[PDB]
Amino acid sequence: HMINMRNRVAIVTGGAMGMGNGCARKLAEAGAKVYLIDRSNLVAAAAQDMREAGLNANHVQVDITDQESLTSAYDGIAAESGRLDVLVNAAGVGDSRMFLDVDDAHYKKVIDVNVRGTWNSCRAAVPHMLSNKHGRIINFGSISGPIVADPGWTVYALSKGAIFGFTKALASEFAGQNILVNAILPGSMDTPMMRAAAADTNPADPQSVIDEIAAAVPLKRLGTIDDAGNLALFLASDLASYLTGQAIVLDGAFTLAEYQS
Amino acid sequence: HMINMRNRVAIVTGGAMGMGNGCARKLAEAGAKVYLIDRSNLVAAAAQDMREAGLNANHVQVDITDQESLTSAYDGIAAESGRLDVLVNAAGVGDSRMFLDVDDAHYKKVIDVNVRGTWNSCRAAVPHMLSNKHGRIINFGSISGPIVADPGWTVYALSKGAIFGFTKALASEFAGQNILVNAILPGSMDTPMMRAAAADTNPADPQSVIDEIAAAVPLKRLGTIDDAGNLALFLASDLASYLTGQAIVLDGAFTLAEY
Amino acid sequence: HMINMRNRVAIVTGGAMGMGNGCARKLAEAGAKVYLIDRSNLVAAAAQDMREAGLNANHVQVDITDQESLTSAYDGIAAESGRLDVLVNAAGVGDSRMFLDVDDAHYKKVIDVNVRGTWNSCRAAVPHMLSNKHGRIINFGSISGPIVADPGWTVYALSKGAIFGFTKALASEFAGQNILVNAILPGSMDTPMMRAAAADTNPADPQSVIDEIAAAVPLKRLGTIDDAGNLALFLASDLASYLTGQAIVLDGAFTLAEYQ
Amino acid sequence: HMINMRNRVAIVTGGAMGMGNGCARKLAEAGAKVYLIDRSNLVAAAAQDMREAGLNANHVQVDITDQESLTSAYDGIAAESGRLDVLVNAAGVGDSRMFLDVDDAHYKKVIDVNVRGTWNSCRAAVPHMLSNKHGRIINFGSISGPIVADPGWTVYALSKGAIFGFTKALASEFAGQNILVNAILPGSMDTPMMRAAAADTNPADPQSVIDEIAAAVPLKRLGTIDDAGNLALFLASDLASYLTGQAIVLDGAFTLAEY
Ligand SMILES: NC(=O)c1ccc[n+]([C@@H]2O[C@H](COP(=O)([O-])OP(=O)(O)OC[C@H]3O[C@@H](n4cnc5c(N)ncnc54)[C@H](O)[C@@H]3O)[C@@H](O)[C@H]2O)c1
Ligand SMILES: NC(=O)c1ccc[n+]([C@@H]2O[C@H](COP(=O)([O-])OP(=O)(O)OC[C@H]3O[C@@H](n4cnc5c(N)ncnc54)[C@H](O)[C@@H]3O)[C@@H](O)[C@H]2O)c1
Numbered sequence A: 001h002m003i004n005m006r007n008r009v010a011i012v013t014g015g016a017m018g019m020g021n022g023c024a025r026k027l028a029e030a031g032a033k034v035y036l037i038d039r040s041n042l043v044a045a046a047a048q049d050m051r052e053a054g055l056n057a058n059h060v061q062v063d064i065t066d067q068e069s070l071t072s073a074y075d076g077i078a079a080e081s082g083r084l085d086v087l088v089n090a091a092g093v094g095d096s097r098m099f100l101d102v103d104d105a106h107y108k109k110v111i112d113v114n115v116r117g118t119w120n121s122c123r124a125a126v127p128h129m130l131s132n133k134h135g136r137i138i139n140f141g142s143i144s145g146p147i148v149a150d151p152g153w154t155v156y157a158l159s160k161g162a163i164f165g166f167t168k169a170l171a172s173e174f175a176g177q178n179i180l181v182n183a184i185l186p187g188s189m190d191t192p193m194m195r196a197a198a199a200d201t202n203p204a205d206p207q208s209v210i211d212e213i214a215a216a217v218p219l220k221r222l223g224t225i226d227d228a229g230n231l232a233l234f235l236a237s238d239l240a241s242y243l244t245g246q247a248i249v250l251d252g253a254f255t256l257a258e259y260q261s
Numbered sequence B, D: 001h002m003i004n005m006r007n008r009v010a011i012v013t014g015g016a017m018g019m020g021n022g023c024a025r026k027l028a029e030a031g032a033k034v035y036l037i038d039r040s041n042l043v044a045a046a047a048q049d050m051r052e053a054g055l056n057a058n059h060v061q062v063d064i065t066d067q068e069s070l071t072s073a074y075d076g077i078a079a080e081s082g083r084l085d086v087l088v089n090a091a092g093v094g095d096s097r098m099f100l101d102v103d104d105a106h107y108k109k110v111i112d113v114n115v116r117g118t119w120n121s122c123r124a125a126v127p128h129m130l131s132n133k134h135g136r137i138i139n140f141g142s143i144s145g146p147i148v149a150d151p152g153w154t155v156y157a158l159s160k161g162a163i164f165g166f167t168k169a170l171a172s173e174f175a176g177q178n179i180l181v182n183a184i185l186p187g188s189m190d191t192p193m194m195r196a197a198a199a200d201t202n203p204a205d206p207q208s209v210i211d212e213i214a215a216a217v218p219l220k221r222l223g224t225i226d227d228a229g230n231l232a233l234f235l236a237s238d239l240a241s242y243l244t245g246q247a248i249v250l251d252g253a254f255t256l257a258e259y
Numbered sequence C: 001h002m003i004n005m006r007n008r009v010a011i012v013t014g015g016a017m018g019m020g021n022g023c024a025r026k027l028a029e030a031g032a033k034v035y036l037i038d039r040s041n042l043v044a045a046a047a048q049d050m051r052e053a054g055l056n057a058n059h060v061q062v063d064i065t066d067q068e069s070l071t072s073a074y075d076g077i078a079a080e081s082g083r084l085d086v087l088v089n090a091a092g093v094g095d096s097r098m099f100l101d102v103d104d105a106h107y108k109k110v111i112d113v114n115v116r117g118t119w120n121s122c123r124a125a126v127p128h129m130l131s132n133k134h135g136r137i138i139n140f141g142s143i144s145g146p147i148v149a150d151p152g153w154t155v156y157a158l159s160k161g162a163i164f165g166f167t168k169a170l171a172s173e174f175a176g177q178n179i180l181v182n183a184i185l186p187g188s189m190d191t192p193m194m195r196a197a198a199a200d201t202n203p204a205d206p207q208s209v210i211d212e213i214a215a216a217v218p219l220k221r222l223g224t225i226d227d228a229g230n231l232a233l234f235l236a237s238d239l240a241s242y243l244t245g246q247a248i249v250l251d252g253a254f255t256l257a258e259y260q
C-alpha cells in the first residue's frame, strides 16, 4: 500500500455531503477512523452509509461557528480515540450578492461559517495534534478571491482570501511542531452548493447551467467530490510530509485557459 | 506633466501618519484635493502641515469601523466637492499574537479595522464613484498572508488575505463601470506601525531591530511612506487606466531573496 | 513635476512600432534621451517623428540576436551619452504553432528574439548602468506562460516563462548595486502584431476579431501602446525606486474574470 | 489500494540518481513498468537495484539533448511495451555563474539540458500518449526563477521559468486529449546536485553547508528524493485526474518564511 492511514484519526467538517463527504470517504477507505462534523441532521445517516461499506466512520452534529460546543466535540473525539492526526475544513457557504445589495446578515453568515468556522476548527484541533507531535490540516479555499473573481462574489471572495492568508500563517507558525497546513482551491465542482447555484441562475433549466460550466473547463467536466477527497487524502498522507503552506488549484485548467473553453 | 491629478478628489484612510500620510501627500502634490480620514487626534496637524506646503488638504476625524459615521463623512465630502475620484484604504492595525494565545478581543480588533474598515470605506465610496463614472480604489494588503508569513501573525495574515480576495472581487464587479481596484502589498516599511513593532521586539534598542530588517532587504533599506505614496499616486493616475485587479508587491526584493 | 526623466538615457528595443514605440515615446515625453533599437529599417522614421514633436529621440538599426553587434551599439550609445540609465526590452515575436507542428526554425526564431535578445540587451547594458551606480531594466513578458495559456503557444509561453524567471534572478543579483529589474506582463494589446493576427484569423472582418477580444476584457477594450509605455515610464522613474523583482500584469482584468 | 499503477509504463529522465531516481522508485513500488532515461554510467545499476527489490525497472543510457537518439529510445520503449502512460522530466543541471561571467558554453549547457532536453522528451512522448488516449507529464521546475532567486543563478532561473511557462502551455494544448501536465517546484532537496553545490561552497565540510540550509527550512530538514517521488506518483495517479496546468511547490515552507 502506497497510502496507509490505518490507526490515524481524522475530523472532516462539512462531512454530511459535498466535498467534505468525499474527503471523509477517501480518508476512511485509506483506513483512517473518520469523524463527520456537520450542522446537518443528515450527518448521522452519512456516517451510517460509510459503516455499511465497511469503513470506520463516526459523526458529531455540531455548528462550527459555536466555539465552545466545537471545542467540547473535538476534546471528546481526541479523548475517546487517544489521538487526532488530520483535520479537513470543508464546511462552507457559497452565497452570492452584489456588493451594493450586501446586508449585515449576508456578510456575517458567509464570514462566520467560512472564516470563523475554519478558525474555531483549527483552534480546537491544534492542541491535540501537538500532543500527537503530528498533524495535517487541509483548509478549503476557492479559486474565487485568490485567483479569479466574477461580479457578485465580494463576501465569498473575501472569506476565501482570508482562508488563503490564514493557511500560510498557520503553516508558518506550526511547521516546527510537524503540523502541515495547506489549502485546496477547487474550481467548478459537482456538489449540492453548485447544483443550488445552478438552480438559482436558471430555475427552469439548472442542468443547462451545469453543462455550460463543464464546457468552459478544458477537461470538459466539473470536478467531483472524489477528486477533492483524493487531494485531501494525499495531503493528509505520508506522500505529502514535506508539503506545507501551499494553496493547490484543483480545477481541470479552468483558471489556465487564456480564452474560455 | 505626465501625472496631473488637478480637479480630482481623493479620500485617504490612515492619512494621519505612515503610508496613508505618504499617499495623501503624493496625491496632493500631483494637484488632488485630498481628505485625510483617521481616528487619530494627529490628523488635524497632518492636514495643516500639507496646507502649509501649499497643498489642498482637509481632514475628517472618524473611525472607519463606525459604518454610519463613515458613510455620513464620505457623503459630506462628495456633496461639498461635487465628485469623488480616488479612495486609498491605508488605515490598519499590525497586532501580533501566537495562535493559541489569540482571544476574541484581538481577533475582533484586527479584523474589524483591517477588513470591515476597508469594506465600510469601499461601500461608502463606490456610489459616488458610480455617479462620477470613474473611480480608483487602492487597498493596503501586506506580503504577510498572500506571499509569506512568520509565526505569531495568524489574525493579521487572515485580514490581509481577506483584503487580497476582496480587492480581486471588487475589481471584477466594477471593471464595467470604470472603477479600478488594486492592492499594494508592502514589505518592511519605515512607519509608526513598524517602529512600534521594533520597540516591542527590543525596547532597549529599537533601531538595532530596524537595522537588522534593512540588512535582510536586498535594496538594504526599509521602504518609505514616499515609496508607498508614489505607487498609490501611479495607480490613481491616467498612467494606470488599464491596470485593475492586481496586488503589487512593494518590498525592495525582500520576498524574492532565496537564501 | 512628479516624474522628471530629464537627460536620463534610455534604450528601447522594438522601438520602431508597437509597445516599444509607446515606451520610447513616454520616456522621451518625460525628458529622457531615448535610443530606439530595432532590426526594422522603419526605426529611422520612428525616431524622426519623435524629433519632429520636440523629443530627444535617436535610432540604431541592429539585430538584438547578434550579441557582438548589439554590444558595439550599446557601448557607442553609452560613450556618446556619458551614461545609460534605462533599458526597455520590448522587441518580440508572437508566432503561434501547434506543439507537434513546431520545427527547429520556429523554435529558434521565437526563443532567439524573445529570450537571447533580452539576454544580450541586459548583458550589454548592465556594465554601463553600474558605471553611474543606477539602472532600471523593464522586460516584456506576457500573461501567456506565467499566468494563462491557450493551445498553439508552447514556444511563445516557454520564451515568456524564461523572461519571468530571468527577470527575478537579474533583480536579485543587482539589487545591491541599485539596478532594479521588473517585467510587464501585457494582456490583449492593440499593436501591429495583434492587428496582423486578427487579419490572419478572419481576413473577411479583422475588426470583428478585435471586437471579440475587447468584449472578453472586463474593461471592454484592448490595452494601448500608451498603457504599456506609461507602466514602463513609472518603473523607470523615481516613483518606483523600491519596486524590483516583480512581474506586473497589465490586462484590464482579462486574467481575473472567473467566467469570460 | 488507493493508488494502483500496475501495467502502466513510465519514462523517467534523470532516473539514475536524485529526484528522478525517487520518482522512478515510487512509480515502480506502485506497480508501474519504469524506464530510467539518463546519460549517467550509474543508470544500469539504478535499474538493477530496483529489480533486486522485486520492481519492474529498465534503463536506457542516452543524452536528452540528442533529440534523434532520445526519440529512437522512446519509440523503442513504446513499440516493445505497447504503451506510454507517464513521463517525468527530472534530468537537469544546476550550474551557477555570476551574470557578467556567463559565457556561451555555460548558457548553452544549462538551457540545452534543462529546457531543450525537457522539450525533446515531451515531443518524443506526446505522440505515444495520444495513441494511448492517456498521458501524465510531470516536469521539474524550481522555486528558483518563478518564486525566489539568489545572485549567481540567472541562466538556471531563466531555464526554470521556461519550464514553468512551457508546462502551462503544454497542459492547455493537450487537456482535451487527456494528457495532464504539471510541474514540481522543489525547494532545498538532498540530492547529488545539492551535495555538489555544498562541496563547492565548503570542500572541507560540505555537511555544515547542508545543516545550515536545513536550519533555514521551517520543517528543519531538506526534502528527500522520496518526497519528490511521492508527489510525482500522486500527479501520475487516478488521485490527480482533475489537476493539470499547475506548478506545485514542494519546499517544507522554505519560500513561506517571512523573517
Ligand atoms: N462546490 C464548488 O464548486 C466549490 C468551489 C470552490 C470552493 N468550494 C468550497 O469547498 C467547500 C465545500 O463545499 P461543497 O460544495 O462541498 O459544499 P456543500 O454545501 O455541498 O457541502 C457543505 C457542507 O458543509 C456543512 N456546513 C455548512 N455550514 C456548516 C456549519 N456552520 N457547521 C457545520 N457544518 C456546516 C453543510 O451542512 C454541508 O454538509 C466550501 O468551503 C466551499 O466554499 C466549493
Ligand atoms: N509598515 C509596514 O511595514 C507595513 C507592512 C505591510 C503592510 N502594512 C499595511 O499598510 C497599511 C498602513 O500601515 P502603516 O505602517 O502606515 O500604519 P501606521 O500604524 O503607521 O498608520 C496607520 C494609520 O491608520 C489609522 N487608523 C487605524 N485604525 C483606524 C480606524 N479604525 N479608523 C481610522 N483610522 C485608523 C491610524 O490612526 C494611523 O494614522 C496598513 O493596512 C498596514 O496593515 C504595513
Ligand SMILES: NC(=O)c1ccc[n+]([C@@H]2O[C@H](COP(=O)([O-])OP(=O)(O)OC[C@H]3O[C@@H](n4cnc5c(N)ncnc54)[C@H](O)[C@@H]3O)[C@@H](O)[C@H]2O)c1
Residues within 6 Å of the ligand: C013, C014, C015, C016, C017, C018, C019, C020, C037, C038, C039, C040, C062, C063, C064, C065, C090, C091, C092, C093, C094, C113, C117, C140, C141, C142, C143, C185, C186, C187, C188, C189, C190, C191, C192, C193, C194
Ligand atoms: N500585442 C499583445 O497583445 C502582447 C501581449 C502580450 C505580450 N506581448 C509582448 O510585448 C512585446 C512588444 O509587443 P508589440 O505588440 O509591441 O510587438 P510588435 O510586433 O507590434 O512590435 C515589435 C517590435 O519589435 C521589433 N523587433 C522584433 N524582432 C526584433 C529583433 N530581432 N531585433 C530588434 N527589434 C526587433 C520589431 O521590428 C517591432 O518594432 C513583445 O515581447 C510581445 O511578445 C504582446
Ligand SMILES: NC(=O)c1ccc[n+]([C@@H]2O[C@H](COP(=O)([O-])OP(=O)(O)OC[C@H]3O[C@@H](n4cnc5c(N)ncnc54)[C@H](O)[C@@H]3O)[C@@H](O)[C@H]2O)c1
Residues within 6 Å of the ligand: D013, D014, D015, D016, D017, D018, D019, D020, D037, D038, D039, D040, D062, D063, D064, D065, D089, D090, D091, D092, D093, D094, D113, D117, D140, D141, D142, D143, D185, D186, D187, D188, D189, D190, D191, D192, D193, D194
Ligand atoms: N536538488 C535540489 O535542491 C533542486 C531544487 C529545485 C529544482 N531541482 C531540479 O530537479 C531536477 C532533479 O534535480 P536533482 O537534484 O535530482 O539532480 P541530480 O543532479 O541529483 O540528478 C540529475 C540526474 O539527471 C541526469 N541528467 C543530467 N543531464 C542529463 C542529460 N543531458 N541527459 C540525460 N540525463 C541527464 C544526471 O545524470 C542525473 O542522474 C532538476 O531539473 C533540477 O534542476 C533540484
Ligand code: NA
Residues within 6 Å of the ligand: A254, A255, A256, A257, A258, C148, C254, C255, C256, C257, C258
Ligand atoms: Na481566465
Ligand code: NA
Residues within 6 Å of the ligand: B148, B254, B255, B256, B257, B258, D148, D254, D255, D256, D257, D258
Ligand atoms: Na523568503
